[PDB]
C-alpha cells in the first residue's frame, strides 16, 4: 500500500543508509521472531551484531561518530520495517533512536553546562559503547533523588542489555534526569516482563536502592507547561511507525494467503478495500505529523509554547487514528486468514497481540488524548 | 451488569434454573484455576470429574433417560455465559456435552427408526456419567473417510476438538465410500484401536478448552454404531443451528466479565474523565444489543427445535438466519466491548496474566467458528435477502 | 422485512390487532400523499379527520370511555412503525394522541384524588373523537411560566416549539414552572385551543418530518382557572417512568423508516439482477443492524409494558428501570437507523438523491430521532454513565 | 480549520495562490446568497458572470493561452474547499471549468496530432472568457450515440447531472460512435446547435445551487472538425485511469471544506454555549481526528496526481493505477468521514440545525452527494480496489 506524503521512502540520505543497513537483520529477526515472543526475551546476540555494526548509533550525529539520522520520519520508517518482523525489537530500538535525538537537542540548544554531558553520551553511543534507555514510569510510589537514588521504574524496554539509564525523578531537599550506569551499586534489573504482546521488547522493572550518582551526570528538568510538549513529541512520535509496520505486516500475510487461495468472495473484496483504505490513512496521517515534528524540531525561533502545541496536536490526532485503525486492520487481516492465525505461534497471533500495546502508551492514552484535543478545540 | 427483558439474564425453564443453581457451586473454583489453566493450556480434569459425577454433563439428557432435562438452547446459552465469565475455555468444552444432549434427543425422538435405540443408549450413558461425547468435525490434512465385505474402516484426522482428552466417545463426521458418496457420523469409542489423541493445542485463547487433534488410522467401527447423515439441503440448517447457537452465550458472558472488571476499576478510581463516560455508555449500549439479539435468536431456535410441521427447508432457514445475524453482531461487538474495557482499565490489563488479557484473547475465537465466519455469513445472509 | 422473534413484528394484544387492522385502509392514501405532504411541509388535515372519525385517535383510550383500549407501548410502537413506513411525519403527530391516551389512562387510574375526573373527562372526549390533545413541552425564547394574578386567577406566559400536530388540536397539556409566596414548583396545566392569548404559529420548516406540523404556540397572558406536581433542579427518578411512557413508542417510527429504506433498496437490487461484492456485504450489514434494532427496541418496550401499571416496588428504582432500557434502545436506534438508511441510499444510487425520491424523504426523516428529549446524545451519555458509575 | 503539514491548508504553486486571492472577493456574496440558492435550487448566473469576465473560469488554462496557468490539482482542490465552505453546489459547478482546463491542456500537449489544434482553440476561448464548457457524461433514457453518415455527424441521446449546463457555451459529450468498428468519442457541441435542449429539472436533496440539469440531443449536427477521440468500448484500459482521476479528484476538496464548515459552525456554537458535557469532548476529539485524516489523505492523493500529471515515462497502465488507487482510498475515506463529521456537528448543535434553512441542514444534505460520484461509488470502488490488491 504505497503513499506519497506517506511513510514509504526515506527523506534523507542518512535515513537511507539505515534502511540499507537494516536490510541484513530482517531475515534474522523474522527467523527468531517466534521464540522471542514465546519466551518474552530480547534477542541479545542480535543486538550485539547491530550495536557492533553501528545501528545503535543511528541517530548519533555524523561528527560524533553516528550515522546522523536526524529525521523522525526516517526513524519511524526504520521502526516500521523492523516491526513487520519483530515489533518488540522495534520497540526496544526506539529507546536508543529517540535517545539519539533527545541528546542532540540538548547538545545544541540545552543549558550551557550540560552540553559536554550530552556530548560524552552521544559520542559513547556512536562508538557502539553505550546502550541507553530512558526509565520513566514510576511504580509503587515515586522515584527519589536526594546524590543517592531510591526508587523503581516499570516497563523500561531494553533495560536487559542497556549500559545506562536516563532516569526521570523528583530531586528532594523540583525535577531531574540523572544518567545512571548499568554497573552502579544497589541497582537491580527484574525479570518480570509478562506482556501479552511486545514480548521481545524486554520491558522489565528496575530497582534503585541507595545508588550513587555524581553531579557530573545530572540533567535538570524544570519544576513540578506547554513548551515541554515539544520534547514529549520528539521522544515518542516515531513509535507510531511500529504500529503502521504491524498493520502492513498483517496485510502482507493476509494478501499472500488470499492470493494462494482462490477466488474472491464478496466479504473478502470489501474487507480488503477497507484494509487498504485505512492503511492509506495511517500512512498519510502519520507522515503528516512526523513532517511537523521534523520541521519544528530545530526551530526555536517562535513562541515556544505554541510551538509545543503545534507538535503535539498532530501527534495526538495521528495516535488516536493509529490506535484505532492499526488494531482494526490487524483484526480484519486475522479474520481473512482464518483459524490458523489463532494459534499462538502463528505470525498474526503475534501481530494481533503486539498491536494492542499502542493505546496505553503516554502521551496520550484515549482518555487523556480526549482532554488534550478537546481543550485545543474548545479553549475551555 | 447490563439488564434486558428478553435479554440473557434469567432462565426461561425451570430445568434451566436447576442447572444455574448447580453450576453456582463451581464458579469460585473455575475462577481460581482460571490463570493456571490459561498459562498451561490444560483442561481442568478434576473439575470435569466433579461435574460429571454430580450430574452436570447430563444436563441436556431428558429426565426419562436419567439426565436433568434442559431442553432449552436459551438456558444453555445462559449457563454458558456464566461459566464463560470465569473461564471461557471450559464453557467452550461444556458446550460439547450440552449440544450433544440436545442433538441426540432430536435423533431419539425424530430420527430414523434404527438410529433411535442408539441415541437412547448414548443419552442414558451421558445421564449416568459414563459417557463424555465430543463432536469431531473439522478435517485436517486430507478429508476423513469411512469405507465398507460389510465391516467398517475409519481413516482421517480431525482438529480443534474441545474436551477430546477426557471424552469417552467421539461422533466423527465423515465421507462414506464404496452407491456414490454419502456423508455419515459414526460413534467411535475412545479406546477403539488406531485412534490417537494429540496434545497440540496452543490457541491464543480458549486455552483451557483442550481443543486437540484426533487421528483415525484404520479404526474399526460397527454397522450398528453408525448415525446416518444425508449427502454432499436447507432442512439441514436446523441441525447446524441446534449444535452451535448456544456458543453465542460464551462471548456475551466474556463481554459481561470485561465490563464488570472495568466498572469495578473505575468505581475504585472515582474519576470521570469525558472519554470514560462516553465509552461506558457505548459499552453498555452494545451489551444491551448483544443481550437482546442473542436471546431472540435463541428463542426462535427453541420454538422451531421441536416443530417438524411445515416445509423443512423453510424451517432450516428460519433458524439459521437469526442465528447468523446475532453471530455477526456478537462477533463485532463482543470484541469491541472487550477492547473498550481493556482501554478503560489501561496498562495493567496488558499483563498477560491479568483477567482482561485472558478475555481479550478468548473473545476473538468466535469469529472463526462455523457456521459461519464473516465471509460465508455474508454469502448466506445476502442470499437470503437477494434470492441470489 | 427482517424477521425477529421478539421483534416489533406482530402485536402482543387483541386491542393492538384491532389498531393495526384499522390502520390498513389509510396506508394507500398516506403513501400517495407522502411526496406532496413532504414538499409542502403540510400536515394532512382531511386525512386526520378521516382517522379521527373512524376511531383511530381514540386508539389508546380505554374501551369503557369509548376507545379501542390499546394499553401496550409495544403495539403502539408497532403501529407507528407501520405508519412511518409510508409517512413518518404523520406517525410522529399521531404519537401525540397515542401517548396522551396512555398517560391520561395512567392518571385516571393512579393520579391524586382531584385529578382523576379531569383525566376521565379528557379521555372520554378523545373517545368520542372530540378532543385532540398535544403536549407543549419545549420552551423557546425564554421559559414558560404560570403565575397567580393578584385576583386569584392564573396566568400562563411563554412560547412552545416543535409541537407536533398542534394546528388541528383542541387541547394542550403545557409544561410550566409554577411561580409563587412559595418555592418554584412544576405544573402541567391543561389549556383549551380557544383560551385567549394563545396563538398557534405556522412556522414548521424541518429538513424532515415535514408533515408532522410541529409548529410553535405563543402563550400571551393566557387564563387558567384555579383547577387545572413536581419541583425543578430536583432528582426525581420515579418520574422517569412517565417520561418513558410518553416517548418510548416513538422509537418504532425510526425502525419503520429503516424497514422502508431496506424494502426500497432490495426491490431495486432484485430489479437489477447481478449482485456485486459490495452489495452483498452491505445487504448483510443492513439486515444485521435491522435485526439489532428490532430486538433492542422490542426489549425496552416490553420492560415498559411490564412496569406501566406496576407500582408495587421502590418507585425511584422503577423509574430508572424503565428509562435505562429506553435509552440503550434510543442510542442504538439513533446510530443504526441513520446508518441503514444511508446504506440503502448508497445501494440505490444517484436516483435516491433527488428530493422527491422516497429515499431522500427517509434520509431526511430519520435524522430527527437523534435530537428528541429524553435524551439527545449528550444527556444520554450523562444519564447512562451515571447509572453505570454510581456517580 | 484543523491543521496538517501536508494537509489542504496552503497553496503549493504561485498560480494557485493568485487563484485563491482572486476568490476571497466572492466569499462574502456566496455566503449571503447561500440560503436562497439552496431554497430555490438556482444557479447564481450573475456571480458566474463576474467570475467569467474577471479571469476566474480560466484559472486552469495555461498563461500562454490567456488563463491564470493553474496547473495543480492540489491547488484546485484547495480553491474548491474554500468555496464549498460557503456554497458547495457553486464549488461543484466551477469544478467543470477547472477540470476542463487541465484535461484540455493534456490533450493539447499529448493528444493525437489531429486533436491538439482543436484543444488549443478551446483553451484560448476559455482563457478569453468566451467559452464555458461542460462535460455531459452520464446517460439516462438509453445510451448516447454519434453516427457517422458522406462523413457528416448526428448526435442522439440524453445526459444528466450536467452541473453548470445552463450557462454553458459548449459541451463535451461522452458518446458511442457507429459506422468502421464501434469506437468511443467525445464530440464538442455548441450551445446553439439545432436539436439541443437544456432542461430545468434539477431537484437534488443537496448541491441545489449546482444547476445539475439534463440535456437532450435530438438529431444534433456536429461538425467533423470538432470530435475529440476516446478509444473503444468495453476494452479495459488502465491508462484511461489517469484522465479519469485528473477530471474528478479535485472534487474531494469540496467535502473537506463542507466538513470544515460544519466544524466552524459547531465549535462556535459550543464555545458560545459555555460548559463542556462529557459527550462533547469526545465527539469533538473524533471530529478533529477525522478532519486530520481527511486533510492528509486527500492531500496525499492530490500530490500523487500532480506528480504523475505530466510524467508519462513508464508504463501508462501502471501510471493510471498509480493515480486511481490513492484517489479511491481517499474518496472512500472522504465519503465516509465527511458525512460522519457533519453528522456529529449537527448532533452537537441540536435541533436548530434541523431547520432546513439552517446552514447545517444545507451541509448535511450537500455532503451526502459525494458517495454517488463516479469514479467510483462504494461498490465499484470495492471492485477496483480489491482487484488492484488481489490481482484478480
Ligand atoms: C524543547 C525540546 C526538548 N527536547 C528534549 C530534550 C530533553 O531530552 C527532553 C526533555 O525536555 P526539556 O525541554 O529538556 O525539559 P525542561 O523543559 O524541563 O528543561 O526533551 C527536544 O528533543 N526537542 C525540543 O524542542
Ligand atoms: C433437523 C435437525 C437435526 N438435528 C441434529 C441431529 C444431528 O445430530 C445433527 C445433524 O443431522 P441432519 O443430517 O441435519 O438431520 P437428521 O438429524 O434428521 O439426520 O443435527 C437437530 O438437533 N434438530 C433438528 O431439527
Ligand atoms: C409515574 C408515571 C407517570 N405517568 C404519566 C402521567 C402524567 O401525564 C405524566 C407525569 O406523571 P406524574 O408522576 O404525575 O408527574 P408530573 O405531573 O410532576 O409531571 O407521566 C405514567 O404514564 N406512568 C407512570 O408510572
Ligand atoms: C491519460 C490522460 C487523459 N486525460 C484527459 C484528457 C481528456 O480530456 C480525457 C480523455 O482521455 P482518455 O485517456 O482517452 O479517456 P478518460 O476520459 O477515461 O481519461 O482525459 C488527462 O487529463 N491526463 C491524462 O494523463
Set out the fold topology.
The structure is a homotetramer.
Chain A: H1 13-22, H2 26-39, H3 44-52, H4 72-83, H5 87-109, H6 115-126, E1 132-135, E2 144-145, E3 148-156, E4 164-167, E5 169-171, E6 175-181, E7 187-189, E8 204-212, E9 218-220, H7 229-234, H8 239-259, H9 266-296, H10 304-337, H11 347-355, H12 366-378
Parallel strand pairs in A: 1-4, 2-5
Antiparallel strand pairs in A: 2-3, 3-8, 4-6, 5-6, 6-9, 7-8
Bound molecules: thymidine-5'-diphosphate (TYD) (4 copies).
Please sum up the structure shown.
The structure is a homotetramer. With 380 residues, chain A is an alpha+beta fold.
Per CATH, the architecture of the largest domain in chain A is Up-down Bundle
CATH superfamily of the largest domain in chain A: Butyryl-CoA Dehydrogenase, subunit A, domain 3
Question: What is the domain tally of chain A?
Answer: 3
Oligomer kind: homotetramer
CATH class of the largest domain in chain A, please? Answer: Mainly Alpha
Amino acid at each position: 500500500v504505497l503513499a506519497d506524503n506517506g511513510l514509504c521512502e526515506p527523506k534523507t540520505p542518512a535515513g537511507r543508509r539505515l534502511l540499507d543497513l537494516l536490510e541484513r537483520y530482517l531475515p534474522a529477526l523474522e527467523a527468531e521472531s517466534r521464540d522471542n515472543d514465546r519466551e518474552a526475551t530480547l534477542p541479545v546476540h542480535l543486538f550485539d551484531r547491530m550495536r557492533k555494526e553501528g545501528v545503535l548509533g543511528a541517530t548519533v550525529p555524523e561528527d560524533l561518530g553516528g550515522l546522523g539520522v536526524h529525521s523522525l520520519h526516517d526513524v519511524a520508517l526504520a521502526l516500521a520495517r523492523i516491526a513487520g518482523r519483530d515489533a518488540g525489537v522495534a520497540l526496544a530500538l526506539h529507546m536508543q533512536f529517540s535517545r539519539g535525538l533527545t541528546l542532540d537537542f540538548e547538545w545544541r540548544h540545552g543549558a550551557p553546562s550540560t552540553r559536554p554531558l550530552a556530548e560524552d553520551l552521544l559520542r559513547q553511543m556512536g562508538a557502539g559503547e553505550a546502550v541507553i534507555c530512558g526509565a520513566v514510569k514510576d511504580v509503587r510510589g515515586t522515584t527519589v533523588l536526594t546524590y543517592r537514588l531510591n526508587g523503581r521504574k516499570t516497563l523500561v524496554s531494553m533495560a536487559g542489555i542497556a549500559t545506562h539509564y536516563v532516569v526521570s525523578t523528583r530531586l528532594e531537599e523540583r525535577l531531574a534526569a540523572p544518567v545512571v550506569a548499568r554497573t552502579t551499586p544497589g541497582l537491580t534489573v527484574l525479570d518480570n516482563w509478562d506482556g501479552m504482546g511486545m514480548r521481545s521488547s524486554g520491558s522489565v522493572d528496575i530497582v534503585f536502592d541507595g545508588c550513587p550518582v555524581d553531579r557530573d551526570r545530572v540533567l535538570p528538568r524544570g519544576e513540578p507547561d506547554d513548551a515541554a510538549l515539544a520534547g514529549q513529541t520528539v521522544s515518542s512520535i516515531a513509535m507510531l511507525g511500529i504500529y503502521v509496520g504491524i498493520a502492513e505486516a498483517a496485510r502482507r500475510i493476509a494478501l499472500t494467503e488470499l492470493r494462494r487461495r482462490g477466488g474472491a468472495p464478496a466479504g473478502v473484496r470489501t474487507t480488503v478495500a477497507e484494509i487498504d483504505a485505512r492503511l492509506f490513512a495511517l500512512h498519510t496521517a502519520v507522515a503528516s505529523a512526523l513532517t511537523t515534528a521534523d520541521r519544528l524540531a530545530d526551530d526555536l525561533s517562535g513562541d515556544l509554547a505554541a510551538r509545543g502545541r503545534a507538535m503535539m496536536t498532530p501527534f495526538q490526532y495521528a495516535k488516536l487514528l493509529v490506535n484505532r485503525h492499526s488494531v482494526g486492520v490487524v483484526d480484519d487481516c486475522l479474520m481473512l486468514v482464518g483459524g490458523a492465525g489463532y494459534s499462538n505461534s502463528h505470525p498474526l497471533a503475534r501481530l494481533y497481540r503486539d498491536v494492542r500495546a499502542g493505546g496505553f502508551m503516554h502521551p496520550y492514552n484515549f482518555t487523556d488524548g480526549v482532554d488534550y484535543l478537546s481543550e485545543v478545540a474548545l479553549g475551555r
